[PDB]
Write a protein that binds this ligand. Structure first.
Ligand SMILES: CO[C@@H]1O[C@H](CO)[C@@H](O[C@@H]2O[C@H](CO)[C@@H](O[C@@H]3O[C@H](CO)[C@@H](O[C@@H]4O[C@H](CO)[C@@H](O)[C@H](O)[C@H]4NC(C)=O)[C@H](O[C@H](C)C(=O)O)[C@H]3NC(C)=O)[C@H](O)[C@H]2NC(C)=O)[C@H](O[C@H](C)C(=O)O)[C@H]1NC(C)=O
Ligand SMILES: [Ca+2]
Length: 273
């Protein structure tokens, strides 16, 4: 088969030496890499920019004529990644080279056969501050119809986090928006944890860190990201080959999802970043 799906809760991706490179989530679809040798025990695969090996034990072959394979498609305005059969995210503007309503396939969401995407928020250095003020960030709740969020009117706390820890406040708002459903998840409400801090795939709610209030949750999560990711040389969102997505989340499209939210906010607020 050309495509395989991950069966266990997570599965590792290995290099040719058998060293772990990353891990990916249950249901993730990987491509067989025909330029490298596979055998009975391990398949050469590609996922989210990463070329490595996976154990056959962890995979199930798909038939693309009847099983869901992630793809990209333009509506003529935006280019969308269907990350799941019933979920799409906008990743880029429509290019003239895209046929509307045609399915396109890509192992990294940047290289296509007939065009190349810029996803600049995916590779942006997150130590550079946003050009949005606290009041501008606060406006996005009304502009994107975000109701009942714990993060409403916390633009000033995001900008303090940025000032103190030197982490981009648009990124911190987009990460909390994606990870905690705009501070509306049960982890957000019970634990003031908007960033999935230690929300491990095996037991996400139980493992998730507890913070004292919303402001200490924003500041404490920012400290945790600075100390565990930025200070360790993971300074952009990226994918399974580089960036925070290598370690932060099993989801191969976590970085692309946060970049998409940054793109959507930036557009609504007038494109200052
Ligand atoms: C839109 O819904 C949201 O989707 C998000 C994905 O797009 C989803 O993300 C979930 O978030 C957490 C943080 O990203 C993430 O947790 C990581 O889990 C792995 C374990 O599976 C941790 O790695 C282990 O770490 C220990 C200690 O370091 C190691 O000993 C161990 O070997 C590691 N295991 C492996 C297999 O390598 C990882 O820890 C890293 C390495 C770390 O400590 O820095 C965890 N990350 C963090 C930051 O703690 C999890 O993978 C991810 N889930 C998916 C599918 O990606 C949101 O989840 C939230 C948290 C929630 O459910 O409320 C989704 N949000 C909602 C509202 O649904
Ligand atoms: Ca190696």
């Amino acid at each position: 088969a050309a495509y395989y799906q991950v069966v266990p809760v997570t599965a590792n991706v290995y290099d040719s030496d058998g060293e772990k490179l990353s891990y990916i989530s249950q249901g993730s679809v990987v491509w067989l890499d025909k330029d490298r040798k596979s055998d009975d025990k391990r398949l050469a695969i590609t996922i989210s920019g990463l070329s490595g090996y996976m154990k056959t034990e962890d995979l199930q072959a798909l038939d693309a004529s009847k099983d869901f394979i992630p793809y990209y498609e333009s509506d003529g305005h935006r280019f969308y990644h269907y990350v799941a059969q019933n979920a799409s995210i906008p990743v880029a503007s429509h290019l003239s080279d895209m046929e509307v309503g045609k399915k396109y396939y890509s192992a990294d969401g940047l290289h296509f056969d007939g065009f190349k995407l810029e996803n600049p928020f995916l590779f942006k250095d997150l130590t550079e501050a946003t050009n949005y003020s606290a009041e501008e960030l606060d406006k996005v709740f009304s502009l994107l119809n975000i109701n009942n969020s714990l993060l409403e009117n916390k633009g000033a706390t995001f900008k303090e986090a940025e000032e103190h820890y030197h982490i981009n406040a648009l990124y911190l708002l987009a990460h909390s928006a994606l990870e905690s459903n705009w501070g509306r998840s049960k982890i957000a409400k019970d634990k003031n944890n908007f960033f999935g801090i230690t929300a491990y795939d095996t037991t996400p709610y139980l493992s998730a860190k507890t913070f004292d209030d919303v402001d200490k949750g924003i500041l404490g999560a920012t400290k945790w990201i600075k100390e565990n990711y930025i200070d360790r040389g993971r300074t952009f969102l990226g994918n399974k080959a580089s960036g925070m997505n290598v370690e932060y989340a099993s989801d191969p499209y976590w970085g692309e999802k946060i970049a998409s939210v940054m793109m959507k906010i930036n557009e609504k607020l007038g494109g200052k970043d």
